[model samples]
Structure formats: C-alpha cells, structure tokens
Target chain A: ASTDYWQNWTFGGGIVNAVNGSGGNYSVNWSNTGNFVVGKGWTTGSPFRTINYNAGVWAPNGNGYLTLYGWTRSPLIEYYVVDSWGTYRPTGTYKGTVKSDGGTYDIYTTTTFTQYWSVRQSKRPTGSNATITFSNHVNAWKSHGMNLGSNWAYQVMATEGYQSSGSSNVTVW
Target chain B: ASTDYWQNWTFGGGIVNAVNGSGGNYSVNWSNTGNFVVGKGWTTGSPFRTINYNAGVWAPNGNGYLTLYGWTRSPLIEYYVVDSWGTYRPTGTYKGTVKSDGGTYDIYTTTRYNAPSIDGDDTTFTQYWSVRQSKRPTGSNATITFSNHVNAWKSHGMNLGSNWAYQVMATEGYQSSGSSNVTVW
Candidate 1:
C-alpha cells in the first residue's frame, strides 16, 4: 500500500506565514519578503494546475529571489513570472531558446497569456537537491513583458506528474 | 502499465493510400484530394507537436475534403493546416478568437506559418469528443482565420488551444510529374 503527503500556504506584502500540512515531512521558511515551502509525499497527479500566489496586494512591492531543492519522479519543474491588471492578465507570447549550464531552456507562452519557462531534464531527480537561481528577478519579468505595476500578479513554482509520486522542497526569497 | 503506440506517414502528390498502422485502431481516408488520419496512442504527450502535412510536392495543386474518425485518452486532437513553398513557411504570430455553432475558436500562429482552422465537421459528434473535417476549395485560398470552423469543443466548455512550434504548408490532389510548385506569401 502507498501513503500520501502534501502542503499549501499563502503570504502577503505585510504578513509572513510559515507552516505545513498533510501526507509527509514538510516545512516553510519566510524571508520576511518571501516564503519557502519544503515537503515530501504524493497525492494529486500533477502540480501544473496548482497556483502559488507571490504577488498582488499580498506581495511585496520590490523584487526578490526564488529557489527550490528536493526531488521528484517527474522530469522538469515549471515556474512562472505572471502579470495582470484589472480583467486582463496578459503575459503575451514569446518563443525563444535560452541556454543554461545544464542545457537550454525553452521559454514560451500558451493559449492563455501565462509565460512558461520549462527547464530541460534528462530524467527525474531521485534523492538529490537541485537549485534554481535568477539574478535580477524583477528584470526577468520585464524581459517577458511583465512590468511591476498594479497588475503584476504572482510568481509560481510547480511540477507536472505522470502518475508520479515523490518529495520536493521549494522556497521564495 | 500504460503502453505507448504511434505511427507516421508521408504521401506524395497524385496518389491516395489510406491505411492503418500500430499503437491502436486507426485509419486514413482521402477524398482523392485531401488526406485525413485517425486513431489512438501517442508518441508525443501533447498534440501541439503533431504536424499534419495535408499539402506539398507530394500533393497536387487543387482542393478537396478531409474526414477523420478516432479516439484518444486526452481531450484535444491537434492538427495544423500548413502552407509552404520553396524555402518559405510563414506561420508568424497571431492572437485572436473565432466563433462557430458549437462555440468559439481561438486563432493564432506559431514559430512558422501554416493556416490551421479547426472545424467541427464531425462524422460521429460526441458530447465530449468528435473528429475534424475540412472542405477546402481552390478558390478559398485566403489568409488563415479561426472563424472558418465550427467550435465543437467549446460546446463541452473546452476552448481550442494554440501550437506555434513549426510552420508548414501543404496541398492535396495530383500533379503531373515534373517540378514541385508551391508559393508562400
């Protein structure tokens, strides 16, 4: 028999909340400007549909850092630097290839305006810790046409599952 | 365990060879002008990567009909009405929406240029699923628009997504063996 585990949280510009929930070992660390979540378990099939809000009235007005460590049974972890205003959440469209130390990253957008940057992976991570580093976090958004305005909404990190089950840790600073 | 099944085919102008391959139950039927493929199984997880070469040097300069019948575990059956000539395939960028009887279709282009108008010309229209068909006439060679097809998926609350990875242009029918003539603007 297989057991399950998972966790979810929300933070804002003025508040910092660090906590954990169901299925396995997990913890959250807030850097006063950002919140980091770490956990292990399995439940939902995929994390693509999951949304982690790191902006808006609940988010800091300035830029910050995003990092993730842990492992999963999936190939790649997906991250987004989203923007929105009023009824329009326009992330526009872009299809370019960016090179990384591990390999090349295919940056593009979908039917909706959300920008997707998929990091290529040769296989799923076992029990190792991997890190994602971005220098001028806000500038990354600007490159994708996401300005730091009232509409600048959220930043998210998620995983895609194929009947997959594993553990991973994530953080925002 | 869920095993994977897949197939690939290439047709030249002036011939109609409709058949089935491995993976699952599938078939192809050309109205002597256009070619239609249907079946199950997938090599690529997303249909966004699937390219339907309905016209090319192997194809003739003319118009015709395309009808498909098949099933899949996924929700969308992705296809592109590609166009290319010589060293040109102009499937540029677009962002807009089109409507039909079933619902609305969002029209857009990808890395290349290929006119794709997904219509609801279902042979057996299911509430949650159905195949696609097209009746393109020679005179209908205008710009690609999403408004050309009936939005069958929207009726089920599903919207048509965009796949702009590669651009292709193709034609169906027979041409005398000589030089392959295709022009893209």
Candidate 2:
C-alpha cells in the first residue's frame, strides 16, 4: 500500500499491507515473492528525543530481517538497526562495531540505497523490542564516521522480507 | 466530532461521546436514551495485583451503573464489580456475598449465554458479578483492590484464568443521559 498516516504514526512499504491501531500500535502481514518492507513509526519521527518506545512480534517463514529503519533528508541516507533475521542476513564490506543497548552491533554501509547499518552482533532475544535509545545509536554511528544529516524523514519499526511470507505486530508505547 | 487515541485506553459505544488522556484518564458524555459503556484498561491485558486504582464520576443516568468490568479466556467470563448504580440495577439469582476493598458485595451469576468475547468470536459464557449492596459507602470514588475481588470470586467458585483480556473501570448508561470524568492509575 502507499505510505499513509494514522494517529501518531506513518506506515508503508513495497507491496505490503499494514494497519495502525492508534499511536505507536500497528500490525502488518504479507506473503510475497518480491522484496518488501512493512512497518510503522513517527515522521519527523521520535529521534527528536522525548518518547522512547519498545515494540515487537513476527510470525514469519522466509528470508527476512526485522529492524528500526528510517531515512535522513539532506544526503538521502537510509539506515537500519537489524535486530533479528530469518535464515539470511545482510552481508557486505564489514564496518567496525559499536557497543550499546546491552549488545554489540556491527556497522555496515551496504546494498544500494545510500544506507548505513548497525546489525546486532547477535539476534535480539526479544526481537524488535526494548527501549531503543536512538541517540545512543546516533552517537555510535557518528563515531564510526556515519554522521546522519540534519534533515530527518521518518523512522519505523519494520519487518523486511525478500520473496517470502510473514505477519508482524509491533506496538510503540 | 472528536475521537482520538490516548495511551492504551479505548472508549466507545452506542450514542456516546468520549475522549482519553493517558494510561487511565478519560471522559465521556451522552444524551441519548440508548445504551453506552465507557471506560479504560488493557487488551491482551493485565491482572496486576501490585496496581490498585481509584475512579469517580457523576450519575450513571436512567438505568446505568459504575463498575470494574473485564473479561478473560480459557474459561470465558464477562465479569463486573458493580460499585454504584442508578435508579435500577441488575436483578438475578443471588449467588452469595463477598467482603473486600473495605466493603461487602453481593455476588450474582447472570446468564449471557452465547455472546461475543475477547477471544474474538461468538461463544457461550457466564457473567460473574459482585454488586455492592445498599450502594457503595465510598460513593463515586473508591479504591479497587482488584486482586481481592479476583480472589473473592475464586472463593465463591468463580474461577478466572491467566488469559486476561481488556479490563476497564467503566461507566455505563442504559436508557440514560449524563457526563463523567475519571482519573485512574
């Protein structure tokens, strides 16, 4: 579905279905053979620093990854904090590592999309949950020379899949 | 023409106007001779014993009542602890009596038969209740020792399981009219 807004969140993706059940609570489900990313979050979103949220839930079968994804405006950067995966994971030129959120995340500037990543060293035990101190990751990425531009787009807790099937429920509260 | 989300609480029902603020703060208004139920709580919910809450509001007009209402699964039950009511109250075969949260309440088991529940579909279930007799001495505002009532129900053979659903401190209006504001924690 096309990108849309509801209550306090905006959600969308490539050929995916999602529903917003008011501020920070959302659900998504998809069964596709094409690349897809379905998620929900705030635009000009929560990195402004007041609200820190935790979210999770995924019943999936395929090659996919779950992340807190967003983009920056000026340099047009897309970023991901990959916490969990299904069978496959993103791999490329290895960047250094940052320790935060009680775990280590490997830095990577991979695929196309002018992207930056903080792939958790180990799968997040609780998947896409627990307080995500966005500022903490921002500082770590900056230290790794991944300074995000000032122009902010949107950030969302997403379920990404490549030619597979799944369902997700993430409530940001 | 104003309906918005506030935290985890949801409010709505026939011919009523509502709004929410946070965890357990909300207000409602209605002027219809229709039925309405308004309040807040959790979904895929909680039965937290550590947190007891307080709430108060005006008359539950016409033929309404103020109560702690909720449901559960496994042994599907639509339960209520009716604290205060309007001119008329629910009448059914008396089950027994229970003492908790600084008052004594009369227990009633009303039949709801096959009705929709939190499990998401239609099914037959029981409506367990603990209606405070002679009106609550605490009036409109009172502390709810939720676990005490939970245990009280258990002691009277009304068992609820771990699969707790939405629980709200509700204000209901049946063929009623009134306004209410409640602050809960």
Candidate 3:
C-alpha cells in the first residue's frame, strides 16, 4: 500500500514506516516493488530511511541470523538495526562499546542507550539483496566483551540519506 | 465465555484457556469480579495454574517495576515470568541468577520450566525461553512492587526482557484438586 509520511503498512505483524528523522520532507510507501516487500520513497535533507519490522524484541542467545536482502539507490545508505532490552525509548547509564567487522558495517553495543545495539552499515549496490549473518555479526561484537543484552527486540533495514536527495528504494525479506 | 479442555477465551490480545495440564479436567473464565480482571477455574488433578497476558517482550533499562496486585485461593501460589531473546522456544545456555527481595514471596529464577509469560509461549510452538522468574508465596490479597529488574538481570549476565509479552497467574496442585480464584491489576 502506498502511504505518506505518517501512514504505515502492516506486514508480518510488523510495520513499515517512512520516517523523517530531521523533520524533512518525504513521501513513503510500504508496498511491493518488483518481487520484494519494498519501501520506496523520495526525501529531502537527512531523513530516517528504513524498512523496519517489529516481531517483538527477542534475545540473542538462541536467536539466529536476521538475513537481509534488497537494493538501494541512495548514495549514502546503511542498515539500521535495534537490539534493545529496554523500553522502546531508553534512558539511563549507557554501557558497552562500538566495533566494526571490517565488513559491511559498524556495530554499536550498549546496555543503556536510546536503542541497545545498532548495526550501522555503509552502503550497497542497487540490484540485489544482502544477507546478514546475524549470529556471526553478533558474535563478533560479543568477542569484544561488549554486553549484547539478553533480549533482541525489533530489526530494521534502511538506507539513511545524509543531506542528499533523489529516489530511494529498499526491498526486504 | 465457556470452554472445556483445550478451550480458551480471548482477553485483550491474550487468551484464558481451561488447560488439562498434567492430566486433569478444568474450567476457566475471564471476567471482572471485585473490580479486577479475574481468572477463575477448577481442576481435578494438580494442574499447573496461571493467568497469562501478551503485551510483547521489552528491555529493562527503560522499563521499570512489574507491580503485581491480586488475590488467590490456592494455598501454594506462585508468580511466573519468562524472558526470551531468541526463537519461540529457547534452547541455549542459561544466564542470570535468582533473587528475592524478601517481599511478597520467595522469588525463584529458572531457565527451564513453565510460565505466565506475557503470552502462553511456554506451551506453544514459540516456546522461546529467556530468564524466567517464578515467585511462590502464601495465598492472600497482596500488593507487591519490583524494582527495575533489568539491573538484577544484567548482574546475572541477563538482559531485561520487556513488554511482558505474556502474563498468567495460576495455582497448581501436584495431585490435588480444587477451584482456583485469582484477580490481577
């Protein structure tokens, strides 16, 4: 379904929204583009770009990989992941550290933050979906002695544009 | 709503099932009695008793206090809670230690067993298990308060699971049979 900034679509008991992080102008649609569940839109300024899902927060111990596959057109693109054991918006003493796997992104690990753990990936091509080896990804950070929390709640994959313009499309599975 | 074995009633994204747990017959209902959401049932065997809810799991850092205010008829009653961060049924290394503040009852923390999760995931396919806390106390009209439990969880190498996902308050009998009446706020 095609929607604007505030409107969202329901898929798999989760929601897909086109959020404006910097209060910029943008249009979002949570519908299928091509053969994938796509969130396509055009934005101005630095807008919050993501095709997020809320399968309720889960833990990482027995959890598996959150494989992500899709494409992006925005020059500045990245994967936005939230692994929190706190409430939706957390506030308290922040714990843990940040690490980069020398791969696709940098992982931020903290016990108390707005969101516990976040995987900030750089960018990808425009014709294919990317698979995230979540177990390996989380283990890498755990090796750093960073507390990855006991609960893994919610996963979001987005192409965050920084002061850029043009059409952005993200297909997720 | 009336139901027999394996039958249940829907209450606010949650279900009230008159489960025949551990070989027993029972009847259950979800209604307001004495201005409280009450779950009353009678069982033949020592069935595992519980009143469960589903509000999704959450983190502990930003969340606080699982204040429980209710009453029960079962002499041996307990409060069950589950926290999962993985698949529906958690089958992995267990983390966290059990602690009780010497309050309403004795708090027991276990990685194995049943629940009163925010939902009934314990008995379903999504048997995802986290740090489960079960408190067995004397039957009475009690008002209890739990401090930010995440800190306790973190100290035990566990994360604070939030949104409660599922909650159920039940009375169990180990070959005993009787009617259990309980209310929650």
Candidate 4:
C-alpha cells in the first residue's frame, strides 16, 4: 500500500505530542494557539482530546484509533491514523501501552503543529472545487517516552479509561 | 457662514505629497499588505455613510448615517447630527475630481459617551468601541468632499466634488487567467 492513504482523513487542525507509556507517561503536554483538532500517534491509542470551533477548550469525546497502514520501513514510511473524536467523548477513554521484545515502553508526545495549511499541493489535477496541500509536521504532545517501536507488535496498544463514558459531540468548523 | 470649515484631513496611501504641499506620504498602489480604510464624520445636515459587514470587511454603501450623540468632545453635548450622507450627491460613476478643500483623515477615538437608565441626561454617556482593534492600523485617502462655495461670492466659489464613490473590492483568493487561441463568439 501507500502512505498516501492518510490523505483521505481530512482534519483541519494539526497534531501536537503524545504520551507513549504502557499505562501513561504524563510528560510533555503540547499547547495550541490556533485550533485543537488532532495529536501525534503512539503504540496504542491516545487519551488526547479535540476542541470545537470557537468553543475554546473542553473535554474530549469518543476513543482515538491510531492505525498503521501500508507498512514500509525502507524509508520508515507509514501513515498513523486517529479515528476517535475525543472532544467531549462521554464514552470510554483509550490509553496506549507500548510492548517490545519482552520490554514494555510507555511513550508520550509533547510536540505541536500550527498553520493555516500544513500541506500545499498547489497544482494537482482538480475535478471539482477543492485544492489540496500536504504537510507532515506535528504540532501537539504531552511529553517524554521511550524509543519508537521496532515493529507493529512492538508498539503500544490503547484502551478506554478515566472519567469518560459518553458520546462524541464534536463537529467540524 | 464659512464653507471650508472641515480641514485637518490626512492621507497615507499611494501618494508622495499632499495638494497643500505636505510630504511624508506612503503610496500602496501595488500591494494589499499596505491598503487602508478610514472613517468619515457627519453632522445634522450631512450624515455618515452606513457601512455593512460583508464577508469580513465593512463596505460603505452610502446609506448608513453617522450620529454624533456618542461623541465625547463636549461633556454636556446633547444634540443629534448627521454627516457624509446628507443631500451632497456624488457625481459621475461615483468618482469625481478631488476638491482642494476635500481630503482624508484618521480617527483615533479614545473614549465614548455612555448612556444611563434615565432618559434625560443619563442617556448621554458616550462610549468608543475602538473599531481599529481587529482591523489594520493604516489610513487611506478617503475621498471626502462636499459641494459648496469657498468664498463669499457664491458665483465665484468652486463646487467641491463627492467623497464616497467607487471603492476597491476585497479580494478573496487566487485568480486564474485563461490564455488560449480561440475564435470570437
């Protein structure tokens, strides 16, 4: 497959850092100035949340799904996916736990990404009323963690926890 | 009665010197990063143009009136006046010659008159909203002119032109130009 699979998930905001520990690695927390939509990936899923447009900041909704598709290590090329809209999610909150050759690593991200458009695919063949851009910069994180996983199985896995148990009410602005 | 009472007007866009031979000008005729818009004044006879909040910019549609009831120039000032939108009609395609007496100026309203509960003098509290907060801090050559005589000789006084006319349209995004070899339709 191709890393370009992520070009389909059209999220407006950018990604910050994340926690990458087995249970939780509350290390570096990323702060956003513009929009709070997404965050970086981890071994499992993340407990990070999103803020609605103009609503400032609020609790996260639903669980986050970080999937690794079209795995290719030649250039260490892989597209990380987050499916759970965690802005005010009343359901179960997922925490990621990293596992490697008998060694478990809890990773946390504390980076952030901010800009009008991260990616700029200026002159692509457009069939309709939409222009495209591309950007791989991360704009979010909580801080501190171990090394990146060696393989898929050697990565962290996410689950639901915390004072969370409701439906996602976050909408796009 | 003096006709040329309105002076102290300033301009700061795409001009090297003023007609009165004033210097220190900033001409922004070729870029959007330096464009500007200024607010005009009105009185009981003449009124200010009513501006509309478009996609974002406040477009002056020559309908809105500027009331001086909210001004703080005089603490005991209690009179309603309109300017800019009175009987002074614009000529041509809304763009006429800029009168020697006509020019642009900047308005830096400090405080406004506040209104109170009582209908009498309490309603005279003036307040300033500071419209220049979110907007750019530059000023434009607001073509504000009036029609009247400059001297006692009405027959000898020159007729000043219009002020509010054709304004520059706000640009949205990139514009595409089509250049091809085609026949006439």
Which candidate tops TM-score?
A: 2
After superposition, the stretches of candidate 1 with alpha carbons farther than 4 Å from their true spots are A1-94, A100-103, A121-126, A136-141, A144-157, A160-173, B1-185
In candidate 3, stretches whose alpha carbon ends up further than 4 angstroms from where it belongs are A1-104, A110-121, A158-167, B1-185
Q: What is the TM-score of each candidate against the true structure?
A: 0.22, 0.46, 0.24, 0.15
Model 2 residue B109 CA deviation in Å: 0.7
Compared with the real two-chain complex, what DockQ does model 3 have?
0.01
TM-score of 3: 0.24
DockQ of 2: 0.02
Which runs of model 4 end up more than 4 angstroms from their true locations? A1-173, B1-62, B65-116, B119-185
- Kindly give the number of clashing pairs for every candidate: 19, 0, 39, 88
Error of 3 at A139 (Å): 0.3
Q: Which digits, one per residue and each the tens of the lDDT, describe model 4 over residues A1-173?
A: 00000011111112222221111111112232212122212222112212111111222333322212222221222323222224322212122333322222222222222111111112112122211111111121112111222222111211222223221111111
Q: Which ten-residue region of model 3 chain B has the weakest summed lDDT?
A: B1-10
Q: What digit string (tens of lDDT, one per residue) describes model 4 on residues B160-179?
A: 12222221111111111111
C-alpha lDDT score of every prediction, in listed order: 0.28, 0.62, 0.27, 0.20
Q: Which ten residues in a row have the lowest lDDT in candidate 2 chain B?
A: B1-10
Sort candidate 4 into its docking category. Answer: incorrect
